[PDB]
């Protein structure tokens, strides 16, 4: 069983890739080829983004996938098979690349922004969520202190409505 089901939407392919590669070690090995592939796609503005279009022919889709894999052994591992399978199954998997990254984080990294009344963009890369959270929050407050602005606490709206409606 994967760390948590990603609720589909072309995330089925990524979920299956995570499960199969988790049968093997294929964890950093899987994510590394994916990161290289995504970087390569970004490295070609066109022919790698316009290549992520439905209009690409089946021969064209297989050829584009093969050419992307042609960047030496940057397409090493089961990611090659997944890319070829998608080449006819579903053309667009950049979101599937991000989902593979999400699965990798779920396997190893975890963590997401808390929120509540803060709009901060931090991270807490630790399995536990009962110790490091406070340290991460205080650090991100005392270091950087970027645009975490929710404008104001919604309780202002709460009190305003509460008083304004008897």
């Amino acid at each position: 069983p994967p760390p948590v089901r990603l609720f589909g939407v072309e995330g089925t392919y990524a979920t299956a890739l995570y499960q199969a590669a988790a049968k093997n070690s294929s964890i950093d090995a899987a994510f590394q080829s994916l990161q290289k592939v995504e970087s390569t796609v970004k490295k070609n503005p066109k022919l790698g983004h316009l290549l992520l279009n439905p209009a690409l022919s089946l021969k064209d889709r297989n050829s584009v996938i093969d050419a992307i894999v042609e960047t030496h052994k940057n397409l090493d591992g089961y990611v090659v098979n997944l890319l070829k399978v998608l080449s006819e199954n579903n053309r667009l998997g950049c979101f599937e690349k991000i989902a593979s990254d999400f699965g990798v984080l779920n396997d190893a990294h975890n963590g997401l922004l808390k929120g509540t009344v803060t709009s901060a963009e931090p991270l807490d890369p630790k399995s536990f969520k009962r110790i490091e959270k406070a340290l991460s929050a205080s650090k991100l407050v005392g270091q950087g202190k970027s645009l975490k602005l929710e404008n104001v606490v919604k309780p202002e709206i709460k009190g305003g409505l509460i008083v304004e409606l008897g």
Binding site: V152, V153, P155, E156, G159, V163
Partner: protein
């Protein structure tokens, strides 16, 4: 909470200016004290009967109507009329 305490302060001392202090409001030109307290206090009687609703105009109940205590003239004619009506009984 600071966002709660500051909101309470800015919404109380300013509420003091609006109501709890007779400072009217600087942001709003016309004070409600020169608008509502007396003239709009007649708004209640503007919707009501003006100088008449609170007043409740004096209307003493009058007397009912009668025959002016007149048996010299009404009695005989009444008797003749009733007997004439009795002619078809």
């Amino acid at each position: 909470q600071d966002l709660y305490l500051r909101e309470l302060k800015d919404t109380k001392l300013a509420p003091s200016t609006l109501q709890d202090a007779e400072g009217n409001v600087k942001p709003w030109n016309p004070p409600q004290k020169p608008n509502l307290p007396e003239l709009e206090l007649q708004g209640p009687e503007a919707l009501k009967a003006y100088t008449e609703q609170n007043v409740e105009t004096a209307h003493v109940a009058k007397e009912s109507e009668e025959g002016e205590s007149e048996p010299i003239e009404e009695d005989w004619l009444v008797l003749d009329d009733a007997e004439e009506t009795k002619e078809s009984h």
